[PDB]
Structure formats: C-alpha cells, structure tokens
Design a protein around this ligand. Structure first.
Ligand SMILES: *[C@@H]1O[C@H](CO)[C@@H](O[C@@H]2O[C@H](CO)[C@@H](O[C@@H]3O[C@H](CO)[C@@H](O)[C@H](O)[C@@H]3O)[C@H](O)[C@H]2NC(C)=O)[C@H](O)[C@H]1NC(C)=O
Ligand SMILES: *[C@@H]1O[C@H](CO)[C@@H](O[C@@H]2O[C@H](CO)[C@@H](O[C@@H]3O[C@H](CO)[C@@H](O)[C@H](O)[C@@H]3O)[C@H](O)[C@H]2NC(C)=O)[C@H](O)[C@H]1NC(C)=O
Ligand SMILES: *[C@@H]1O[C@H](CO)[C@@H](O[C@@H]2O[C@H](CO)[C@@H](O)[C@H](O)[C@H]2NC(C)=O)[C@H](O)[C@H]1NC(C)=O
Lengths: 323, 170, 167, 322, 166, 322
C-alpha cells in the first residue's frame, strides 16, 4: 500500500504509421511526410517570365509564318515554349526544316525576340512575287503561302539570276530563314522558273551553302508532290549575308532580332495557362514546395525536388503510440 | 525502455513527451520533465530539417528533344534519368527507415535516462517494480515528490526516516 | 560487458539461460527476446533487398568510331553510377552491421537486468553475468526467473536469514 | 552454491563481416547480398528467344549475305546477339546508311516477316542474273546479296527505271536499296551503258538523289568498287518511288516490321541454353532478387545494380566467440 | 549524471579520478581509450578508403549545333553533383551522431565495470563517483582501475561505516 | 569516505561539428574529409606532360599555321591545354571537318611524328609556289599553311592529278587535305583554268567526292574565298588515292600517330609548373586522398567526387566543455 513514482511517455489518438528498418506498420504520435505530391494544375510563369504558348502551331510553322498560326509574336521574351504533342499546323507545304531540333532548343528561352522586315517585296522588280501560292497553305479558304518568306516565280518567261545582299545594321543577332523548292519534273521547272538547271548560294562570314533542286517522284502530302526544304542561320551584327540563285528560291522577307542569355527546353502539355508564378513547372502543373522529393512528373522545368518512384516518405517525429 | 519496463503510454500526459506519475496517500497526478522533452522535440525538429535543408537543387530543363533518328542518344538520356531515379528512390527509402528507427531509439534512451536518474536518487529507499514505477518505503509528500521530478532531492531528510519505515514491518 | 564468452551448448535460439542447481545443470533458450530479434534482422535484411527499384535497361556500345565524344559521355555516366552504388552499398553494409551487432548486445543485457530487477536481494551477482543464489533455489524456481513469474515473497524472510545472518 | 546465468549463441561458424569501426569480426550467421553467380548461357528474356546471328552481322543478315545462312524465320526476338567481329558483314565492300540506328531499332522486334515486293520477273529490259561478284562466293562460285538485285544492262541498253510500290500491308515495311560506285568510265559503260547516271527514291518523307562516285579506291575483298546501301520505313498505305538509269541495286524483298519495345545488341560468344531469365549478361544469365551484382557491366533486362565489390556480407547472427 | 569533463586528463579519453587519504589524482584506462582510438580511425579510414575513384576526363567537346547533347551532359554533371553533395552532408551528420554516442556508451560501460567489482563494498553518489565504505589505498585504487578488486578483503570494513554511522 | 570517479577528457578546442539533431557542437578533435587546396599550376598527368598550345588551335597546329610557332616536337602528351579563344586558328578562312572528333582523338597520344609523304617535287605539271595568301603571312611575305600545298595552274593548264600514297610505316597516319572555294568564275579560271572541277579521295574505307562552292561570301581575314580541310587515319599497308582537276589543297606532311588511352581538352590560362599530379583542374592540381572536393568540376584524372559544400567535418574526439 506504499507510494509510487512512475516513468512513462506521451500517447495520443494518432493513426499515423511509419516503417522502420526493422519493423513495419508502427503507429507514432507525430509524423511528417517529406514527399511532395501537390501541383496547382496550371501553366505558370517561370521566375516572372511568361512561357511562349503556341496553341495549335509548331515552332517551324510559327517561325516561317504558317498562314493559320497567328502573327504579332506578342511575347518579346519567354522562359520556355509550350507545344502540343502533335501540333496541327507544322508545315502546310510539305518539306523539312534543317536542324529543327537544335533550333527549337535555342528558341526555348529567348531574352529578346523582334520580327523586322529585311527584304521587302519591292526588291524583286524582275520576278513575280505574288504567284507563289499553293492550295497546301490555305487562308480563309483561298490558297496562300508562308507569310515570312516569298515564293519567287518567273516573270515574262524569264528568271534573271538573283544577287542580293543584306548587311545586318542592327545591334542584335538576326535569325534568317530561306528555302529551296524541289520540283516534280523538268516541265514544272520551266513553267515555274524557266531555267532547266538551277542552284542556290548563301554566303556569310561563316556560312558557305550551295543547294540544288532534287527533281524526283514522291508521294502526295497535303495534295502536293513537291517539297520545300528550309534553312536558317544566325547573322551576327555588321556581318552580311549574300543570296545567289537562278530558280527554286524561297527568299526571306522577314527576319528575327534575337537575344539569348539562358537556356531551357520545350514542354509538351495541353493544360491551360493560369496567370501564376513558380520556381518549378511540370506539364501537368506547377510545384510550390521545399520538400526534397516529389513524384508528380519527371519532365520538370526549373528548380525542382528530386523525382522518385514512391507514394510516401514518412519520417517519425513523435513517440511510439500505443492504444 | 519504451516497450520495456514501461509497457503502455499515458494518454493523460498531454503536457510533454516524457514525464512522471506520482501516486501517494494525498494525490495521484501526472507531470512532465520539460528539460528532457524539449531536447527531443528540438532534436527531432533538427533531424527533420537536416534531411530537408541539405538537398542541393539547381535549375534544370528536362524534355524530349531527340528525333526518330537519334534513338541511341535518347536511350542514353533514358538510362541517365532512370538511373538517377533509382539512386534517389533507394536512398530516400533507406534513409527514412534507418532514421525512423533512430527517432524511436532516441525516445527509448531519454525515458531510460529519466528512469536511471530516479533509481540513483532514491537508491534503496524505494522498490524497483519492473513496470517503471518505484514503490516508496518512507512515504513521500508532494514536496518530496517534487524533489524527485525536478532534482532537488535533499536526501539527508529521509536517510534515517527511511530506516524507520524501510526495514521495520518485515 | 557482463556476459563474456558465449555458450556453444545453447542451440535452440540466440539468447538463453543457464542453471546449475543441485538437481541438475543445463542450458535454456529464450523465445520472446530471440524471436523479436529474428524478425528484426530478417526484416532489416529484407528492407535492404526489397526497397531496390529495378527497371528494364538495355546496356550496350552502339556508338561508332566517329561518335567517341558521345560514347565517352556514356562511359562517364556508367562509371559515375558505379561509384555511387559501390560507395553507398559498402557503407550501408558497414553501418548496419555495427548496429546489428550492437542490437544483440542490447537484447542480451536487457535479459540480464530483467533477472536483476526480479531477483532483488536474494542473490549476489558474480560479475561474469551470473547470479549466485545464496538463498535456496529449485528447478521449478529456475523457470519462474525465466518465465518472469519469480516471487520474492517465497524466499522473502529467507533472504534475511542469509543476508544479515551470514556475517 | 546454485546460480543462474545469462548468455548467447556460439556455433562453429568462421563467417566474417566488417563493421564501420572494426574489421574481420567473426559471426554465427551472415548473409551476402552481392550476386556473383551466373548460369553461363544465353537465355530467353521473359519468354522470348533472342535473334542469334552466328557468323553474321546485322547488315549481312538483312541484305542476304550468301555466306550467312538462309533467312530462318524468326517472328520475334527480345535482343540480338552478335560476335565481337562478325566474319560476314558486307562481302562486297561498301556501307549501310544509319547502320547503328538501324541496329538499335532492330534490337527488339514484336513481328518480323520478309515479303517479296518487286520480283525479278519485273525487269524484262534489264539483266537480273549477271549482278554477281567473286567478292560474294556461294558454294565456291560467284554470287551476290540475296535480298537485293544488281541490275545490269541487257542488249547494250539500260532503259530508265520507273517503279513504284504501295504498302498494301497493314504493318510498317523496312525497304533496303543500294547504289554501285564504278571504278572507271569503261567499267561504268560496260555494265550500265550510261556514263552519267543517278538514283531517285521518293516517299511521303524521303527525297533522295544519288550519283555514282567513279574514282580510284583501295582493293577490299578483291574489289575496288563499292556499294552504298540505304533504308527507310515505308508507312502503311504509303508508296515508294524509284527512278534510275544506272548503278541501281534494286530491292526484291522488304520486311514487315512491328516494334513495341526497345533493347540493345549484345556482343557474346556464349551458347544459347534453352532457358529463361529476367536479366542477361554476355557471360551468362542472372536469376536473383539481390540488389547488387558484379558479374558484367553490359546487361539487358531487370538486373541488380552493378558495383565493384567481391563481398557485401550482412551480419545476421551474433558475435561468434571460439 | 556524469557531468563536465576533466581537463586534468591529458593522456587518454576515458579514465578515473580517485580521492583517498594519500591524495587525489587522475588516471586513465588505456584499453577503453585505445578501443575507441582504434575504432574512430577505422571509421574515418572506412569513409575515405571505401570510395571508388576512376580516371575521368571532364571537358566541353560539343559545338554550338550540339547544344542538346551539351544539355544532356550538364544534367548528368549536376545530377551527380546533387547525389554526392546530399550523401556527403548527411553521412557526416549521421556518423557524427554515431561517433558521439560511441563515446557516451564507452564511459557508461566503464562506469558499470567499476560497479561490478565494488558491489556493496561501495556506495553510488549519483554523479559518476563511488563512495567507498572502507579505506582505499592507491594500491586498492589501482586494483579497481585494473579490474582486480578483491571483494572479500573489504567486506567487513564496509559495514563499520555503513550501519554504525547513524 | 574514499571516492573513485568516472569521467572523460576536455581540452582547449574551438572546433565545432554538426550532428543530425544538434548544431554547433564543440569537440576535442575533428577531421575534415573535404579537399579544398590546389597548387595553382598545370602539371604532368601521371608522369606525362600535357601538350600546351599557347596561342594556337589544334586546327592551326596540325595544318601548320605560319603565324603560329613551328613544330617543337612533343612525341607524347597526356592532355591538351587550350586558351578560351586561341589567337591563330585558320589564317585563311574556312573549316576543318569533324574538328571535335579529331580533337578528342588527339587529346592523349602516345606517339606523334610529322613525316613528309608527298614532296613538292611530285607536281611537275603544276605550280607549287604561287599558292600563297596575305591572310597567312610569314616574315611579312605572303605564305600558306606549312603542311599542305595550294596547287595552281602552270602554262594556263591544270592537268588532272592522279597520285597515290602507301602507308609503308608500321603506325597509323593522320593525313589532312582540303578544297578551295572560289569567289567567281573569273577567279576559278585564273587559278585552275577549269570551269567545273572535282576532288576524289579514296582509301580502303574512305570514298569521298568534293566540288568547289563558288559563291559570294563575306570577307574574313581579308578573304572571301574559303578552304575546308578534311582528315583521315590511314592504317598501315593501306593506300590513299587522290584525283582532282582544280581547287585541290594537297598534303605534303602527315603524322605518324599511336593512341593507347583517352583524355580531353582543358581550357585554362594557368602556366605549367614542372610537377606531377594524379588529378588536374583548370585552376590547379590536387594531391589528396579525400573522397570529396569543391575546387572545380572540369577535372582530368583520378579525382575526388565534386561536391557543393564548404566543410565536411567529422567528429573524432569527445564533446568538449570549457
Ligand atoms: C496505296 O494504296 C491504298 C489502297 O488503294 C491507297 O489508299 C486509298 O486512298 C484513297 C484516297 O486517298 C481512299 O479513298 C477514300 O476512301 C474513303 C472511304 O474510306 C472515301 O470516303 C473517300 O471519298 C475516298 O474515296 C481509300 O479509302 C484508301 N484505301 C485504303 C486506306 O485502304 C493509298 O492512297 C495508296 N497510296 C499511294 C501513295 O498511292
Ligand atoms: C603497300 O606496300 C606494301 C609493301 O610494299 C604492300 O605489302 C605487301 O603486300 C603483298 C600482297 O600484295 C604481300 O605479299 C605476300 O607475301 C607473302 C610473303 O611475305 C606471300 O606468302 C603471300 O602469298 C603474298 O604474296 C607482301 O608480303 C606485303 N609486304 C609487306 C607486308 O611488307 C602492300 O600491299 C601495299 N599496299 C597497297 C595498298 O598498295
Ligand atoms: C556591313 O556594314 C558595315 C558598316 O558599318 C561594315 O563595317 C564597316 O567596314 C568598313 C570597312 O571595313 C570600316 O571602315 C567601318 O569602320 C565599318 N563600320 C563600323 C561601324 O565599324 C561591314 O564591313 C559590313 N559587312 C559586310 C559588308 O559584310
């Protein structure tokens, strides 16, 4: 019947369970999860810069001026590019864009982007600048063409040898695009360019390119058997570019003043922009967190926790609860 | 300790994490040792932070940027992304399992330390019951109880007084 | 510490007891303490195995002599992961091995003290992990110590007949 | 005096482990978590046999190298086994465009079926029999690749070829063709009758134009000439278009191909062993649940993490004291 | 209850302090300090010597038209940076906890080692010191540190100070 | 009564380490495992000196840029030290094909030696002394690269060139050659007399055709013409066959080359310091056994793991109390 002094610990009504190296399913008073699984579900700005959201257009269609792809550039600077998985408006007239993927990589994060006309249509007095129109590139139902380049055709059954130059009197780098049209037969060559054998020469301080058309039989793509291969180069300030051709020349009209400081990648996502900000962006939503690990998505853009294949990382903070 | 001498756990002890329970002829109440607890929560909070705050995070842009004729390079990137995933997944899982033990053994040690301090304060003027509770001989007042909880045990008081209760009715 | 040596003769567990009364001498094996240790180290071993995430990976050398820069990039990654895995695995074994051995030390001591807190003052420690029962003991009394059902009141006054009387 | 004791186990074990603070500590029981054993045979990967080319490279097997054995129909495979230096790669000297990417795509195939798309009878005005060289003997007699035809002039005439094939199959088609580079002007006209020739291959995506490179080269396998081969994946309901007036190595067979997963090419000399596994190495297969192994770095499948160790021994027993 | 840490001990890590009629002095237990110094040096050697180092050549060999591959290598470099940084910082934190408690356990085991010989021949002061119930020379003091204490030789003298002092 | 106590050691010690549950814990002794020191020099890598191009690029050094220093023979080297922007790379504007792959192969070379393979006496019908330019000056006079020869017409004729070379050495040969692109049709006729020209290069494995791209370009180093250079490795007992009728930059010298191991190219401005190391960084060398370092990520050699930290302090002693 004597007096007693006891020693013990705290218990509560917690259902939280943690696993140890030697035991599983151990209920504890308090616990904390270091895994992050929450995203706001929106496309947000990365460190205050709005992403360039191409809606139904690819980078190639946007750059060359696909008639169904929106002009006006809007964003002069972007942090990352959001394309769709399979953009509808890539290249209305079938062909290719040389080094498309590295070009996409460079344009992922642009500090300054401005479209300036470098070669106006009035600079082709001896050629036809208004008939380079195909049903492959329709606008308002009427046949059209890429906006930022001009499809030069013969005039009065003659195609004088084109020799033009541009000096880049700007203080920023210029992105210039041009192309070559591959005909289907020798008659199309004469009916469009009048010169049976043609060439294209582009020259800068660092670019030495000579192309020739490849007349051959190909399948129909967008109802067209011909092809047009597009090329691009970066023209440094005070450096000049020289074009020489006598046929099959898709001449540039507009170029792009471009300034690039940082680098990013292109994200494939369809979810909607939400007027927010974040330090970590994923294709399904942005992450605001300080936790060291997450399992939302592996294709992250920004400063993010480490991606893991786990549903729970629960640390035991409290004592061993016992009912 | 936690499942050793003390077998259960007091739902009535809501003041702290570790503590005491006195049961004498004038009362029966719980109490805590704010010293021994606050080191545990501070240390536990430090452990949770030390795991979170030591992670270095840098800006990275992850995407799929290789075409159908660069599958070997994309496979090279897959081995890297997957390889880093397994490194981070395995390390995270074992880190929690190893550290979750250490928290539980940490709580084991503090309770045993509180028990060990009392065992020497009272020497053999009380009984070790094996349940963690100590069976007093000398009869202990709330002042005497406090001398055990927050160490102020003026042992000279009951040194002889225990003799007049310890071995008497035997 | 206390228990120095280690009994071969016990073969029925991991921790056990030894009795040497006049009715006989022999060993015994605990169950609750040993079995809790069997699960702990089996789960600890299984935790290291089962927590490993394994995926399908095809490892090869598919870069020609004009892609040696890319091939070296693959080599740097392969060697980097080997250095991480070799270092993490070797330290994981070393760290967990020390704690597994100390887990056995704690379990053994937490049976020696269990006898100590049950024996009270009826016997003298021997200093080698044994308790010299200077009072009287029985074979049935031997398991009451192991069962945790030892009753001091049986030999309560008998203890004073051997403690203060034997001078 | 009668006394009770507290103690532990000590068997005869000599097994030794290491602790972060002590080395060579003998224990009663311990477990090694580093896999070191393999069966020493090539196996099926999740119940699919690999495509094992004995003496042949991938290019030689595709193009129908005569020394390479006939096309044993392999409907599917999980990976491809080559030797370190395959003996029969390309009996006529030359190259195969995008070979490493082509090898990578072919590493794991769900369905593979060879079909005839342009039979030899489809060349009334060209010679389909003399496209044969001593660089590719068959049975001690000159031959050529079996799945392509080397067209030569007939009656001192090489009319311009215009043939097109529409993929009426439901699966992707792998089509290979080639161009022969002549050694001199006399040899060029002795086979093709046209000094300046070309090859044009067109699809929905492809737009190719080649010309022969008539020049002097070193003698490989007895030939100073070369043959450059190409390939493309013809999508269903697409058509390929060929046009040439010389130096054309036309196709006779294509390949119905269905790809679902991906793998790599393993270089090994080990013999197939009618087995099955989740992990395969060039020296053998691993049947394991262990997290680490040190057998071989070049693995295919679901494998433990390769490390540099001879032991990973976890102490599960107690300190064994003799 | 073992509070402080003696500055007068400049020979080892763990030891004793005796106070008898002849004088008061400090002494160390060579084995426990050694067993500790063999251990931590093994711990620091294990952390250093278990690292696998291979010859590597790190550079920047990709041009401006290979920036995707450059980004691939970058993610690889920063990936291993984060892995090695994170594992390193935590390993020191975890083993520093292990190292400290290793010293704590050693001093406690040494405290018990004295107790298992004194038994009832000496008290326990609850501060890390034992009050002898008899007279102790430096020879008997060295009998305790060595581990050769003779329980019978001071059993009766224990009771003269124990029960007589009321 | 007599007393005996248990205690531990304390000293003067301001050293602090960190634990997983505590911060700024003073200890008696501590040790850092993070390497932070370097000697600030570029050193021999495991005994072998690097190859230090001071103001020259690899392209300029191989082709023999006159504005660069002449060949101070270094038969072997362990790695290449280059400046961020070398001053002299290609005096005549142009390019070098597969430059990075060529630089990667030249990063570590066991044996390297320049040999004359085609002396200037081998072009009796072409002018070998008028191939000079102001863009490549030597001693104030117009000159050219010192290992290749710019062939020009003689007597207003450029007869077709057909020259072979057999690698009779026992070692591989690094051979370099180029083509010159004109600016207009007039410049082409004044130099080679042939309006349409070509270059054929043939080995056992190489089959190359080149044509000059005559066009308008910007002025670089005062020149609008360009010269692209190409290279190959001629295995022993193989031959290389050249054919051209204009715009040919023929080789005079080639490089006997033996490769045993691999390395990379280091960009650094630091100076060589006559010492040895197992681990080199662009800011200095590391002599350490520690597993981690934080000096620089671009290491060459057997180096500690780069980490982002300032202090990795392990506790070795006890918790110090003043
Ligand atoms: C290769 O041969 C196939 C089979 O002949 C060609 O596919 C066929 O293409 C035509 C026109 O592109 C399809 O005609 C359309 O059929 C739908 C009914 O499904 C009808 O509503 C339309 O008004 C139109 O008549 C036809 O269905 C399709 N046959 C298939 C898919 O089996 C293919 O065009 C050929 N490719 C080349 C390059 O020649
Ligand atoms: C480059 O020059 C070397 C040396 O002049 C040529 O190597 C020689 O090649 C011939 C084969 O054409 C070898 O002939 C063989 O000789 C052995 C006896 O040594 C004989 O048993 C064989 O039946 C055969 O006739 C000759 O040995 C070899 N000389 C060497 C290796 O020193 C080489 O062919 C030339 N390469 C080119 C591309 O011209
Ligand atoms: C593009 O135009 C600029 C005009 O400034 C040219 O740069 C000038 O070149 C002349 C002759 O070399 C110098 O005297 C001027 O000082 C230069 N301008 C400046 C602002 O320094 C440049 O050469 C042209 N680029 C071409 C033609 O490719």
């Amino acid at each position: 019947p004597g007096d007693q002094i006891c020693i013990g610990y705290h218990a509560n009504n917690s259902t939280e369970q943690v696993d140890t190296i030697m035991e599983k399913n151990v209920t504890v008073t308090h616990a904390q999860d270091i895994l992050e699984k929450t995203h706001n579900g929106k496309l947000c700005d990365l460190n205050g810069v709005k992403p360039l959201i191409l809606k139904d257009c690819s980078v190639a269609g946007w750059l060359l001026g696909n008639p169904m792809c929106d002009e006006f550039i809007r964003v002069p600077e972007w942090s990352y590019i959001v394309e769709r998985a399979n953009p509808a408006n890539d290249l209305c007239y079938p062909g290719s864009l040389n080094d498309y993927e590295e070009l996409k990589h460079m344009l992922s994060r642009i500090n300054h982007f401005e479209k300036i006309q470098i070669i106006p249509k009035s600079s082709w007095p001896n050629h036809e600048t208004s008939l380079g129109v195909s049903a492959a590139c329709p606008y308002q139902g009427a046949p059209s063409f890429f906006r930022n380049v001009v499809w030069l055709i013969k005039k009065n059954d003659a195609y004088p040898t084109i020799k033009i130059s541009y000096n880049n009197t700007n203080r920023e780098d210029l992105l210039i695009l041009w192309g070559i049209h591959h005909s289907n037969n020798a008659e199309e060559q004469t009916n469009l360019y009048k010169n049976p054998i043609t060439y294209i020469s582009v020259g800068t301080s660092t670019l030495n390119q000579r192309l020739a058309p490849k007349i051959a039989t190909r399948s129909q793509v967008n109802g067209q058997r011909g092809r047009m291969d597009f090329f691009w180069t970066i023209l440094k300030p005070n450096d000049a570019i020289h074009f020489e051709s006598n046929g099959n020349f898709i001449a540039p009209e507009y170029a792009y003043k471009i300034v690039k400081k940082g680098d990013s990648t292109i994200m494939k996502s369809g979810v909607e922009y939400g007027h927010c900000n974040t330090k970590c962006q994923t294709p399904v939503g942005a992450i605001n967190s300080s936790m060291p690990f997450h399992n939302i998505h592996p294709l992250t853009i920004g400063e993010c926790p480490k991606y893991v294949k786990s549903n729970k990382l629960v640390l035991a903070t409290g004592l061993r609860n016992s009912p | 300790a936690i499942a050793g001498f003390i077998e259960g756990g007091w739902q009535g002890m809501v003041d702290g994490w570790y503590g005491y329970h006195h049961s004498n002829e004038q009362g029966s109440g719980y109490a805590a040792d704010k010293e021994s607890t606050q080191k545990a929560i501070d240390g536990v909070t430090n452990k949770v932070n030390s795991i979170i705050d030591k992670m270095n995070t840098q800006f990275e842009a992850v995407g799929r940027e290789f075409n159908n004729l660069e599958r070997r390079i994309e496979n090279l990137n897959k081995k890297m992304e997957d390889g880093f995933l397994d490194v981070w997944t395995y390390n995270a899982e074992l880190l929690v399992l190893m550290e979750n033990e250490r928290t539980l053994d940490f709580h084991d040690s503090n309770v045993k330390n509180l028990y060990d301090k009392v065992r020497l304060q009272l020497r053999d003027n009380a009984k070790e019951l094996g349940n963690g509770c100590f069976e007093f001989y000398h009869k202990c007042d709330n002042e005497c109880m406090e001398s055990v909880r927050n160490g102020t045990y003026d042992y000279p008081q009951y040194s002889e007084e225990a003799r007049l209760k310890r071995e008497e009715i035997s």
